[PDB]
């Protein structure tokens, strides 16, 4: 008794990151395959590269169990950072907004203290975790948002490891943005742990997805 997941005008990226124009009426839990247009209107509303994208669509294509849960709760994970960041490029009903499943972390009280956040998969299912790395268009923006010019983002899981050094770059304007957010994801097998360490530039997970590929 399994129907396809209909994404409407949205891409998998827009749907899985929580593009504010991509909330379905009935949030579905299992599905046979994903239906999406050749050029969906609404995907990465803040421009940037979605890494290993077709692979994620393959892996999300058949799903028997799907549960959203707040991996790093907004009102308790980040006491010393500003979490409320929105963007005009991710607007909804004419108001600036942001991906529902991510949080733009920025400085607080003139400081961006080094962060370190761990999550251990006790869901007894695979857990899909998504995050982003911000590349500002100039160094003034880098300092204003993150108070460092030597930023690092490191993500380590037992089956994925990567240290990002986001550098400044003035790219062509896309949805009014010259900077970029690059999007990444990893599937956490049960019992595995993921660690985020950063001193800036991290678009942090807020919601993750426990899932069974049945």
């Amino acid at each position, epitope marked *: 008794a399994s129907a396809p997941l209909q994404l409407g005008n949205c891409s998998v990226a827009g749907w899985i990151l929580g593009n504010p124009e991509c909330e379905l009426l009935i949030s579905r839990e299992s599905w046979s395959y994903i239906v999406e247009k050749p050029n969906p209107e609404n995907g990465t509303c*803040y421009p940037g590269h979605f890494a290993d994208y077709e692979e994620l669509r393959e892996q999300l294509s058949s799903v028997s169990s799907f549960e959203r849960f707040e991996i790093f709760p907004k009102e308790s994970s980040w006491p010393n950072h*500003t979490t*409320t*960041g*929105v*963007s*005009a*490029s991710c607007s909804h009903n004419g108001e*600036s907004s942001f991906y529902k499943n991510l949080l*733009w972390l*920025t*400085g607080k*009280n*003139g400081l961006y203290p080094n962060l370190s956040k761990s999550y251990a998969n006790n869901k007894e299912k695979e857990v899909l975790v998504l995050w982003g790395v*911000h590349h*500002p*268009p*100039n160094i*003034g*923006d880098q300092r*204003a*948002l993150y108070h460092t010019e030597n930023a690092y983002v490191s993500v380590v899981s037992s089956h994925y490891s990567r240290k990002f050094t986001p550098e400044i770059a003035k790219r062509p304007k896309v949805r*009014d*943005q*010259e*900077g970029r957010i690059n999007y990444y994801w990893t599937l956490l097998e049960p019992g595995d742990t993921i660690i985020f360490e950063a001193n800036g530039n991290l678009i942090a997970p807020r919601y993750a997805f426990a899932l069974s590929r049945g």
Partner: antibody
Amino acid sequence: QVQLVQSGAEVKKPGASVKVSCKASGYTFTGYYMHWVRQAPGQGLEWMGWINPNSGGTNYAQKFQGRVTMTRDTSISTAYMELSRLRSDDTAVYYCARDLTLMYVHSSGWERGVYYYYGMDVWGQGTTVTVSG
Amino acid sequence: SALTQPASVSGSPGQSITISCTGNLVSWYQQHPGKAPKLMIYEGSKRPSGVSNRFSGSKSGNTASLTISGLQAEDEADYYCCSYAGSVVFGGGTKLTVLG
């Protein structure tokens, strides 16, 4: 060196209007709210209102609503306060003052998304406006 | 909607004074005569970068306080508390004299 440089001393007649300018340097003008505060001779500070230079939205003090107009020109990083129907007891020093909270970083498309007043951390040198008939 | 400060306070050099503000996100400003105000304390007790830790803020009941330790003559000035409830409200101000 973050700095607010205000326009020069003004002398006006009662019933006139005065427009004071406040030019920001050393930071991105659209990133922070801009308050106006005045102080009559020997008196305390009194808030006049704020403008959000990114959007142009304003919030005026009860004492001045109906009489004060705040505007800005972002291309020249300048805030303006116009106060009309002047009376002698509008003689005062008028200060522009930057709100301390970073609210926007427009070249990165970042917005704080929520506003609360925590204080004013950079101030202009002040403008003397004398009203006399 | 208004905050009440004492009209004046005085202290000898090296002492500590406390200025009160009765009505915790109060901010405090120092103004020397003829010069622009200066932010000394915000959010009740934080100091902006570069402000001396001789200045500290505290609360108690419906009273916020600014304490200055190790008074120096340059601390002679007017002090304003400030709060907000949809509108920014300054206290009436305290003239602090460092007795000479």
